[PDB]
Paper text:
The E301R protein (pE301R) from ASFV was previously predicted as a proliferating cell nuclear antigen (PCNA)-like protein through clamping DNA polymerase to the DNA duplex, but its exact structure and functions remain uncharacterized. Here, the crystal structure of pE301R revealed that it is composed of structurally similar head and tail domains and shares significant structural similarities to the DNA polymerase processivity factors, including sliding clamp and eukaryotic PCNA. Taken together, we revealed that pE301R functions as a sliding clamp in ASFV genomic replication and can be used as a potential antiviral target.
To gain insights into pE301R functions, we determined its crystal structure using the single-wavelength anomalous dispersion method with the selenomethionine (Se-Met)-labeled proteins. The residues 15–162 and 165–301 could be observed in the density map that was built in the final model. The assembly of the tetramer produces a central channel of approximately 52 Å in diameter. The homotetramer is mediated by the interactions mainly between β9 in one subunit and β13 in another one via multiple hydrogen bonds/salt bridges as well as hydrophobic contacts. For example, the side chain of K148 of one subunit forms two salt bridges with the side chains of E230 of neighboring subunit, while Y152 of one subunit generates hydrophobic aromatic stackings with Y228 and F223 of neighboring subunit, to stabilize the contacts between the two protomers.
Residue numbers in the entry:
A (entry chain A), B (entry chain A), C (entry chain A), D (entry chain A): 17 to 160, 167 to 197, 200 to 208, 212 to 301
The structure:
Amino acid sequence: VVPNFERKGILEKPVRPQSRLEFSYDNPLIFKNLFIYFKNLKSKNILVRCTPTEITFFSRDQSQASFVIATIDGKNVNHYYASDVFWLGINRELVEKMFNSIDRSFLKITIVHRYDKPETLFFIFTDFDIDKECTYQITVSEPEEMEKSISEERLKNYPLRWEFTSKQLKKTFSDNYTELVTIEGDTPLHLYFQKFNSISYHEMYKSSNKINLTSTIPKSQVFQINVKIAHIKSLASAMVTDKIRILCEENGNLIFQSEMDALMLNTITLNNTI
Amino acid sequence: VVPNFERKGILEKPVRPQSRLEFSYDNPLIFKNLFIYFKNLKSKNILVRCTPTEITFFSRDQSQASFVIATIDGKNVNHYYASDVFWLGINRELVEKMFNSIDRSFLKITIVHRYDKPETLFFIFTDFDIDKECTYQITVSEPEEMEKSISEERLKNYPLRWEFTSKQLKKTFSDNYTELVTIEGDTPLHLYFQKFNSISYHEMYKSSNKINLTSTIPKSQVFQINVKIAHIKSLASAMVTDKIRILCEENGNLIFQSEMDALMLNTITLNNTI
Amino acid sequence: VVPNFERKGILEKPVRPQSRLEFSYDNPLIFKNLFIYFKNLKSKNILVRCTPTEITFFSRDQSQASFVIATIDGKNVNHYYASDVFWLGINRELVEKMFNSIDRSFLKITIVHRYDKPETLFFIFTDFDIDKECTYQITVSEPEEMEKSISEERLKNYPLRWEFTSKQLKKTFSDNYTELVTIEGDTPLHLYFQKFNSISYHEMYKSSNKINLTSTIPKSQVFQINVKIAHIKSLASAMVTDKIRILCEENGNLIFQSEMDALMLNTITLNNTI
Amino acid sequence: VVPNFERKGILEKPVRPQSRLEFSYDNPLIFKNLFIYFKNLKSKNILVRCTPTEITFFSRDQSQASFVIATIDGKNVNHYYASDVFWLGINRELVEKMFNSIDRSFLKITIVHRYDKPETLFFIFTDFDIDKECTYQITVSEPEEMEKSISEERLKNYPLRWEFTSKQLKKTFSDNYTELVTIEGDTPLHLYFQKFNSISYHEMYKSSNKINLTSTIPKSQVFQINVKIAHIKSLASAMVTDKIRILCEENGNLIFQSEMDALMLNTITLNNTI
């Protein structure tokens, strides 16, 4: 029993007049996978920002080296209404079982937040074989760094970007130091680090199009950064997607970008960590 | 070698003039599965009532929260005679191996009780590939609560009933408290309890026909019961059938009903247990 | 590379004039299986009698309840010569590895005993893919009860015999006492013993032809024997064949008979064991 | 993406004017398997001799009973240049992971040694699906018995040679002593030793052509050698190829010869070891 689900996008009014937030989507596995990623990074509390145009989940990883911004725009889901801008806090372990219980048989997820129950976030999963709606009442808080969202504004245009598959990235970083990323016109991308037993190891990408690399680096100006390999390896081990887009800045800042469906998964790792 | 077995039903006389009870049936696995159920409930002694029209096996589970009545009517088996009404006691561990030794190759089970051997119950299994009859002499006692059979008389007409599969019931009750069953005309069946980590969880059945639900509850009168979830979960873990029919009473009484073939398996869980 | 092997039988002269015994056969697995049987019975020394017409291997099992006579007649093998009647002793553990090394690729086994090497028994296995002959020099002794061979002479004609498969015999004896074998004209074969937890158990074979049973018991004279079930169960666990013929005597004596190919495997269990 | 690789052989000049050695080959698995063999023999340091015509890897096994000479001639690879005769030392554990990381997806291996980096040996592996070159900088030494290469000159013409598969050799030597190899015209090859429990065991090869045996032994002169079976068994357990050619000398010297592709793998075991 697979119904066809209309995609309505942002609505001007909610279906229930008491809803501060109404969300529904026909791919609930994005939420299961989002929360596997949070578990792998050992994020303890997930902060949520709801807005008339999108819902955003935020957390540092446990090491605090990296920050995750997961955004779902309302125009890309089946049903989205949010009255205004508000914030919620969700303890990750509390919702872990629920999100893990989703499988490929769940055809829908609905999330409701009502003015008259400000400490509750309702998650609704419908099974359409027998028409049973299953609801979880997840207690949430309001917590009122800050803006790393600037790093991923439409305009912050990074000079060096490419794409790895989960396989490629985990092969590269297979064997307590840094890895140098260096480029250049003709752009051989160079990656160098020390592998097992202090052996100097070098990868050279001769074809920018096979790894979908783009560069805005001026012809003869060199780009070289030194980033810590332990942070990269942990982000690789934690991936839930098949592909990441890596974006690099001259001061060493790194943005990892994965897309699931309506979900845009951004992981920022700035070079300011001691 | 599969013979065709005539179904004769209740006979007016036995084949052996000394038989107080003669039973035979062409689906011996019902007895294997009946006795797996008794083992799962850890019933220690199985009491038997034989009657000119049916044979009934009785026992409490080990917790005493539930009572099992398993009935096989003589009109539905291959061969049935009983001289009068009498009672026997069978120690479950004593017959456990025998009943577990049945498999899909057994085409017949015969049970004989003779006046001149009042402490013996004969079980006969025939293998028709080589025409060997194998007989067990099971020592039995006569023990002379009482009538919970009233709860399942033809007339005790419960206002709320539905059907779950083994899968559905075990999914519902997957994660030390009670579960509220509530209904209402339009009947959304509501089930609510606390799941992992004190999360309020709610199942709502919008289609009465997909779970084969029937209700005799008057239009606007509410039906709500509170029953202990530990007793339900143990009955679910113990099921040997694929489907149960759940019947509910306004005072919280519950009757679970499974059918194997000629065997009707009833499990009663009244709301009087402290 | 499978050659065709001529079956010559008993020859009047050996190929090598110094051979006291020359044997060869195109089914060496009979020897592997014979020696698995000896290992299962934990026979320590295997005695061998060689004769112008046949070779015989003899041993008690470790319990001494049973005696094994394994005979290979020279007329049924590819090549057989024996000068006269002589005896050899073979330590079983010494040859166990060799006999276990045979597999379905061995197409031939040759055994040679020469006058000038009276403490040596030569075993020769040929691999015809590359034409390599592999030879083992097995040191043997000469040891010069006695005649249980009388029990299995052509004339000792037992009143009750039948056949079980390995499966049937192991099912019958599946669960420290005796088993009664009883018969009778119309011959229902009856077997009775105590199964698990002192339950009296009875098997009745209504069709003599499905178990290939023959009886020479006079019409109305009863035949009943009591034999120890532990000895039977050990012979069943030790079988290397798919079928045994059971032969019974009125004093309780039992002969088990299996055939491999040219090998006749007899196991005698007389009722004189305390 | 499988390109076609030109085989150019020895070049008169290198592609990079600073190369003392340039090697490349389109079967990098020969190097993986060469280094599995060295690991199995527990060779600690691998010595390398580079020459305008070939590259040679040398090491004793850990027991020092055997010496390995692995030669790759430049005329048989895709690209080979060497300026002169020079020697390098490679610690085996240091390169073990790298060589083990090769799989059937590697289509190329390049090895470069440059005058201006005399302590470095560069290994380059190219992945042609995405055009990434991966390079390892392996630190090497220069170490400046000696000539066992004489044993395998074109002219040292051994009187007895044959071929075993890995399977055959490991079956022969399946079960602290010596094994005698003896021959003779008509050449039955005889092999004799003591197998399990002091049993004299003899293999006789009646067909010289099925094991590809050649002999230059004069008609009636006997050839017999006694070699230690422990050294043979260890070389068998260590094989990485499917076939070895065994060459024998009258003083007991043994040469084992395997070919991978361009790699000739020679293992010498002279009879001078105490």
